[PDB]
Design a protein around this ligand. Structure first.
Ligand code: EAM
Ligand code: EAM
Lengths: 114, 107
């Protein structure tokens, strides 16, 4: 489905996060081979990334904005769970997630199909 | 604002009474829990009691600020705890409700 909220998530939230200077670790799935992380998929059971979310938004995969919001959350949470407290990527996720929250606070209030 | 009233009366109320909410209703007490490293690792402690008090005292200027506090609370939990800890699942569950409810926040 296309809805007002999903349109906003795509054209405002994803637009802003994708081009952010801290977006680059999150633009594609975590590549455990490239990164040398033999435990990544043992710890993180539902990988998510902004490449997947953006493709889902482009292909009308979502029925409601809440589903898309959960994917963003999962991506950020995975990052916090997997990494150490002092890792830079935590600070990068935090910066992106605050923008995510700021924009979500101003999303159209009642979901309706376009 | 109307949004803050919603975060207080709808969002917070739904989260607060949840069966997984008990760890999050008051600040982490690092002495009582025996966590001498808690405040070394977590630089901005946050909890729903603090947020609730802030909502009740007109501390917030925008809904977004309140939402950031909720996020800080959840994030602190994921950062401090082990991936396999039950509290991580509890936080994840509450965080999903938060986002679900926030999605219907009035404009
Ligand atoms: C022990 C080393 N740890 C890692 O590599 C974890 C990895 N850590 C990073 C990462 C990101 C930034 C820095 Cl400065 C260092 C590491 C990472 C880098 C990527 O490059 C394209 C993609 C996903 C990543 N990511 C995400 C997202 N979640 N965990 C990680
Ligand atoms: C090694 C022990 N670790 C801890 O005690 C961390 C602590 N862990 C818990 C906790 C919560 C639930 C369970 Cl099942 C086990 C531990 C905790 C329990 C509380 O009881 C009133 C309050 C805050 C908590 N919390 C929050 C919030 N973030 N980290 C923790």
């Amino acid at each position: 489905r296309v809805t007002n909220q999903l349109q906003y998530l795509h054209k405002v939230v994803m637009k802003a996060l994708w081009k952010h200077q801290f977006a680059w670790p999150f633009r594609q799935p975590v590549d455990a081979v490239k990164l040398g992380l033999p435990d990544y998929h043992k710890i993180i059971k539902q990988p998510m990334d902004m490449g997947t979310i953006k493709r889902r938004l482009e292909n009308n995969y979502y029925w409601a904005a809440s589903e898309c919001m959960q994917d963003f959350n999962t991506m950020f949470t995975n990052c916090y769970i997997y990494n150490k407290p002092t890792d830079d990527i935590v600070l990068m996720a935090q910066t992106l997630e605050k923008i995510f929250l700021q924009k979500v606070a101003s999303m159209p209030q009642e979901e309706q199909e376009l």
